[PDB]
Structure formats: structure tokens, C-alpha cells
Amino acid sequence: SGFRKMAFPSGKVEGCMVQVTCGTTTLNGLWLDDVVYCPRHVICTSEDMLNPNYEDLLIRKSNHNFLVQAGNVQLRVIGHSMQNCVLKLKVDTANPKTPKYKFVRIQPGQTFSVLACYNGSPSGVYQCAMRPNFTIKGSFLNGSCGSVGFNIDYDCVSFCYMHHMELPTGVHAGTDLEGNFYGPFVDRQTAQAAGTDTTITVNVLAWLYAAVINGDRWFLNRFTTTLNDFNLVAMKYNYEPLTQDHVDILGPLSAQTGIAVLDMCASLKELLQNGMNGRTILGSALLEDEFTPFDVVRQCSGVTFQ
Amino acid sequence: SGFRKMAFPSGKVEGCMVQVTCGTTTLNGLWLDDVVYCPRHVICTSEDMLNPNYEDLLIRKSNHNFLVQAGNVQLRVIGHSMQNCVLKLKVDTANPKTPKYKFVRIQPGQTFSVLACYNGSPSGVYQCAMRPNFTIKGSFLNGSCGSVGFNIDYDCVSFCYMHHMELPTGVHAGTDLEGNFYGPFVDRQTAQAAGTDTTITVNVLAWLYAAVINGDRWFLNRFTTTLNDFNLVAMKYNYEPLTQDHVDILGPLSAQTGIAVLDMCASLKELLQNGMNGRTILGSALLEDEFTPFDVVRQCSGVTF
Ligand SMILES: O=C(CN1Cc2ccc(Cl)cc2[C@@]2(CCN(c3cncc4ccccc34)C2=O)C1)NCC1CC1
Ligand SMILES: O=C(CN1Cc2ccc(Cl)cc2[C@@]2(CCN(c3cncc4ccccc34)C2=O)C1)NCC1CC1
Ligand SMILES: [Cl-]
């Protein structure tokens, strides 16, 4: 029993974190085999950020301008290249702690663990979701750039995020491990703002199923809804539209509890209209949207507390 | 910017988790040097749990009755002993991944990271606090016994909890690594219940300071209070009494924000008597009490391990 915001064990990722320094700029790198991946803005000063010409800044650099430190050992850079917004530093030593891994680009609504790092040293691990506006609500200070997001389903680490910046509203933006930004952001200090964010409806529904599995049903009702009527109401509360794909993905949770997806949608409609009236759901007074259907199945018991 | 419920990196603990099997019971063990530590109830069947005589159950066991598996390697048990509610299995191989460590017993209000494990394999990591009633609000299924709680300071892992059982309300109970239970619990199948819990006041105050550090200031006011007048409010709302020690511990957070502790107490008093009026603090509609003053300082400074 219980339901917590749970991160993947971070050990496999901790063994990949290194410090990358270019001149006066220091940040984190990810060392997999003989390559260290890091944000390309490691080659920029604060003034370079207004309108950086990364190609012009990079051509002036040699391999020995990049200092890479793994623990208390200096790695030797023997090559460098830029791929989108990521710098790939070829080193002369393969990481002996390289886990089984993949680079995966995730969609909004998907969750992942973040290993926050400073100076190549891990400080903490927490769970995040890619928001519908492509930002993440992380906890990152200056020096955290290059910290990564990942999932570890079945002993293989799937790297999905690398940290690059904090937006004026205090939320965060970054790239996949190929250097492609999530959202319409650029690694430039120009006017950029997080678009209006919305609630991840399929995740709220998954978390309501989690509350039912753990033995709570106070929020259910005798009503049902059509998908379009549900969407017409939900969008009035800044909730993402629920698609037929989301209904399909909720199938196993619907089967385990015996509650049809559109019946749970009717409960969600009522909760949006009424609030919780002094009650909580899984120890929360707000509707939680950073647990996916897959996360609930992973954490919750396969047996419902009927 | 940002404020999240953050756990310590779990790598140093993952390298210590093993599977321990005794007959039909399978749970997790902690392998440090040549000893594997695990709940002593690994030697019990469901019927034994009704009224177990652990010394009598243990004397009937040989070293070869304990199957210890580290990854896909079988460890050989060469000795066994019991210390309080923990079983210590001497093995023929020292763990090459043993970190620098200490066994520490924590007080209620203190937080720690839990590395939830099943069959000796880590599944997840989350943060939690020892409640004033000595239970923890964890997330554990059958097979999670032997999973541990810990904190890190520099390179040293301080092991503070080992998981043993779930109570009827869905909360959890366990021991320190010397096998002493937190709370008035026993490792037996009998009627046991979590006592009435209270809110960790010093932690709520620390989290209000974290909200001010992050730009949330709507709840601040021109008022102050005495510690005596605040404690009368705390008792009325099921909050733990705030002591001069708690005020001293909040000193660095008070200095960073320029808000006196008793000044923050007057803000909490008004929140307790009026609610949030449709507002949130750090994305929460409830007053959060599972961040200590040290957790707030550590997260807002970037301490590494
Ligand atoms: O003070 C700056 C200037 N930043 C320009 C800029 C522009 C583009 C890119 Cl890709 C990167 C950056 C920087 C590189 C470091 N960085 C940070 C990343 N993660 C957490 C942070 C926490 C505090 C300060 C900085 C952080 C950036 O956003 C610095 N940004 C933050 C202001 C609130 C808005
Ligand atoms: O059905 C039982 C019988 N338990 C007796 C008992 C008595 C004393 C001790 Cl130390 C241990 C135990 C057991 C050993 C495993 N265990 C569990 C630990 N953590 C999460 C669990 C989740 C589900 C089931 C069991 C769990 C215990 O509490 C099993 N407990 C669950 C009922 C709510 C209360
Ligand atoms: Cl995805």
C-alpha cells in the first residue's frame, strides 16, 4: 500500500556524470562509451548568449580547450563535434561503468527521473513530467546544465532529457540526447516564454485509478459521459483533450478496477466542478497529473483493495 | 529555481542490495562487507508469525538453509546470528561495492530516502519522513521487506531504516539497522495500529521558508508572535510543539530570507486559522511537513555526493 512520486534508482546514471569546463564556464556532461555529451552553450560567455554563432565560437576551439573530469581523473579530449544543441566530446577512455542504454525522444505527458548534478557530482533525484507546453517543472540552480532525465525499464537506461535553461517563470527547458529542444525554445537569451500550460488529463485519470486500487472510491458517481462532452468540459478547466489513444492506454487500469474510462471521466468532471470538500485523494488536496498509466501499473498492486 | 521532493542519489545503496530466501519466504538483504542484514521474520512461515519464538526457529536452521543471491551470483552463508529484530548472515565474500557507512537511529521529523526493492533488485527511490507516531508513509508491496532508508553526508551513507511491515491504515513500520523498531511495534501477526499522528511544525516552517526563497510570499504578514502564544495554536491544530531548539535550527533559513522565525510563526498561525483561500504554496493546497530545515538548505544550495 501507499503511493509516492517515485524515481528510478539513479546508480546507472551516476556512473556516467562528469564535469566539462571550457574556459570560465563549467557544467555537467554525460559519459557513455568514449563520448561525453553536454550542452553546446559550454563554449559561450554570458554576452555570447544574446546572438551566439555557435559554429564560429566552436571553430576557434581545439580538443585541449575542453577539460573533462570524471571523479578526480582528467579525461583527454581527442575529438569534438556539434549535433544540434549538444556538443559531443570524443575522449581517449571508454566509460567502464557505461550501462545498457538508448536515446529516446519523449512526448508531453510522459514522465522521467532527473538526476540533478553540479560540477559533475550528483546531488539528488526526483520525478518529472514533460508538460504539455514542453517545459519541465524541475529543481535546478546555476551549474545544473547537462544534468539528465531518464527512465530504466528492464535494466536499460533510456536517456530522454538534458538540461539547458531556466525560463523567466521558473520552469525549465532542455533537449533530447540528439540536441533537439523540446518545444519552441532556443539556446539563446532572447524573449522566450512558456506557453499557457494545461493539466495532463490522461495522467489525472491514471492517478484516480491508482486511488481506487489503493481502496478509495468516494469521488465516483452514477454518471457517464461521451468523449466529446468530457473534452468540452475539461478544456474549460485548462485540461488537455483526451484522445481515443488515451482511452486505449487506460484499458488495463479500467479492467483491474471494473470502472469504464468514460465513467472515470464523469468522476473527473464532477471533481472539477465540486472540488474535494475537505477530502484528499492519495494524500493530495489537488488533482495530480505527473503519474502516467504505465507509472501507476508499475507502482500499484496488481490486486485492487475492493 | 524550483522545489521538488528530492531523494539522495541511490547508487551507493543499490550496490548493497541482495535477495535472501529461507524456505518459502523471500525478501531483501543489505550486504555490507561480509555480512548480509535482513528482517529476522525471513525464518517465519505465515503460521509462525502468529506467535513466533525467533531463537527456537533460528536454532533449527543451518547456514545452507539461507539462500543469498547478489545479482546472478550465489553467496555462501558461513554464519548466522540475531541482533534484536535483524538477522546477520555472515557470508564468504566481502561486498566489493561496500560504501563508507554508518548505522544511525533517527528521530521523528527527520527525513530519509527509501530504495524500494523486490527480489534483491531496486525498483525505485523516494523520500519520506519518520512521522511523530513512528510510522512512515511509504509505498511498499509484499516482497519489499528488507528495503532500506538512508541519508548521505559527503561520501558516507547513513543507514537509518529497514522495512518490516505494513499497518492496517496502509502506513509502514520498520527498524533501525541494529533491529530496534521505531514505534511500539512488534514483528508478529497481532492487532497493532498506527497511533494518532501530528504535523511536524518545524518542517512546515522550513517549507514556508523554501516558498519565500522561490518567490511565493503572499502568506507573509506584518505580525509577530511569542513562542508560548504560537504553541497554544499548534496544540489546537494537531501540530507538534515548537521548541527553542527548532527556532535555533531555522536560523540559517531566517538569515537567508530576512524573516524572523517568530515572524514566520505568525504567518503559519494565520494559515491554520484561515486556510489558503483558493491559493497554493509551492504547487500545494496543503501545508507540507516532509522537508526538514537541512533539506531546504541542501536543495537551495546544490550540495553534491
Ligand atoms: O540568468 C539566466 C541567464 N541564462 C541565459 C541562458 C540562455 C539560454 C540557455 Cl540554453 C541557457 C541560459 C542560462 C545558462 C544557465 N541557466 C540556468 C539553467 N538552469 C537553472 C538555472 C537557475 C538559475 C540561473 C540560471 C539557470 C540558464 O538559463 C543562463 N537565466 C535564468 C533567469 C531566470 C531567467
Ligand atoms: O497481510 C499482512 C500480513 N503481514 C503480517 C506481518 C506481521 C509482522 C511483520 Cl514484521 C511482517 C508482516 C508482513 C510481512 C510482509 N508485510 C508487508 C510489508 N510491507 C508491505 C506489505 C504490503 C502488503 C502485504 C504485506 C506487506 C507484512 O506486513 C505480512 N499484512 C498486510 C496487512 C495490512 C496489514
Ligand atoms: Cl513518450
Domains of chain A: 1-14+100-197 (2.40.10.10), 15-99 (2.40.10.10), 198-301 (1.10.1840.10)
Q: Cα torsion at A258, A260, A263, A268 (round to 10°)?
A: 90
Cα Rg of chain A, angstroms: 22
DSSP string, A89-113: EEESS--TT--SEEE-PPPTT-EEE
List the single residue in A with minimal CA-CA distance to B154. Answer: A123
**Any idea what DSSP says for residue A241?**
P
Nearest Cα neighbor of B292 from B195, B209, B212, B169 is B209
| Exposure class string for A283-294: b at 16+ Cβ within 10 A, else e | eeebbbbbbbbb
The beta-strand segments (E) located in chain B are 17-22, 25-32, 35-39, 66-70, 73-75, 77-83, 86-91, 100-103, 111-118, 121-129, 148-153, 156-166, 172-175
Q: Count CB-CB contacts under 10 A for residue A151.
A: 20
Catalytic residue among B16, B22, B38, B41: B41
Q: Count CB-CB contacts under 10 A for residue A199.
A: 18
CA angle B223, B225, B230 (to 5 degrees): 130
- Told to judge if A164 belongs to the known catalytic residues of this protein, a careful annotator would answer no
Alpha-carbon gap, residue B21 to B36, rounded angstroms: 12
* Mutation to test the B interface, candidates A125, A131, A276, most B Cβ within 10 Å: A125
Nearest Cα neighbor of B194 from B164, B165, B169, B162 is B169
The Cα of A19 is separated from the nearest Cα of chain B by a number of Å equal to: 13
CB contact under 8 A, B125 and A125: yes
Which cell is B191 given? 492487532
Alpha-carbon gap, residue B295 to B301, rounded angstroms: 10
Alpha-carbon gap, residue B217 to B208, rounded angstroms: 9
Nearest Cα neighbor of A175 from A25, A8, A37 is A37
Nearest Cα neighbor of A281 from A213, A208, A221, A223 is A208
Pair B90, B35: CB distance under 8 Å = yes
Alpha-carbon gap, residue A76 to A91, rounded angstroms: 5
Which residue in this structure is represented by grid cell 539461507?
A: B66
Mutate to test the pocket of ligand 1, among A46, A82, A164, A166 (most ligand atoms within 8 A of CB): A166
Residue type, B152: I
Alpha carbon B110 to chain centroid, angstroms: 7
Residues sharing a CB contact under 8 Å with residue A227, sequence separation 6 or more, in sequence order: A242, A244, A247, A262, A265
Distance A154 CA to ligand 1 centre (A): 34
Pair A116, A140: CB distance under 8 Å = yes
Alpha carbon A194 to chain centroid, angstroms: 16
Which cell is A128 given? 518529472
Q: Which of B9, B126, B280 sits opposite A5 (nearest CB)?
A: B126
Smallest CA separation from ligand 2 atom 7, residue: B189
Which residue in this structure is represented by grid cell 556538443?
A: A87
List the single residue in B with minimal CA-CA distance to A15. Answer: B11
- C-alpha dihedral sign at B130, B134, B137, B139: positive
Residue type, A218: W
- Told to judge if B164 belongs to the known catalytic residues of this protein, a careful annotator would answer no
Residue B262 backbone phi and psi in degrees, to 5: -65, -25
Q: Which residues of B touch A291 (CB under 8 A)?
A: none
Alpha-carbon gap, residue A300 to A6, rounded angstroms: 11
Residue B162 backbone phi and psi in degrees, to 5: -135, 130
B168 touches chain A (CB under 8 A): no
Q: Residue B158: left (phi > 0), alpha (psi -120 to 50), or beta?
A: beta
Residue B41 backbone phi and psi in degrees, to 5: -70, 0
Alpha-carbon gap, residue A135 to A200, rounded angstroms: 13
The beta-strand segments (E) located in B23-155 are 25-32, 35-39, 66-70, 73-75, 77-83, 86-91, 100-103, 111-118, 121-129, 148-153
B137 touches chain A (CB under 8 A): yes
Instruction: List the resolution, Å.
Output: 1.7
The Cα of A276 is separated from the nearest Cα of chain B by a number of Å equal to: 11
Residue B228 backbone phi and psi in degrees, to 5: -65, -45
Residues sharing a CB contact under 8 Å with residue B91, sequence separation 6 or more, in sequence order: B31, B34, B35, B36, B68, B75, B76, B77, B78
**Nearest ligand to the C-alpha of residue A140?**
1
List the single residue in A with minimal CA-CA distance to B15. Answer: A11
Pair A147, B2: CB distance under 8 Å = no
B139 touches chain A (CB under 8 A): yes
Determine the length of chain A.
306
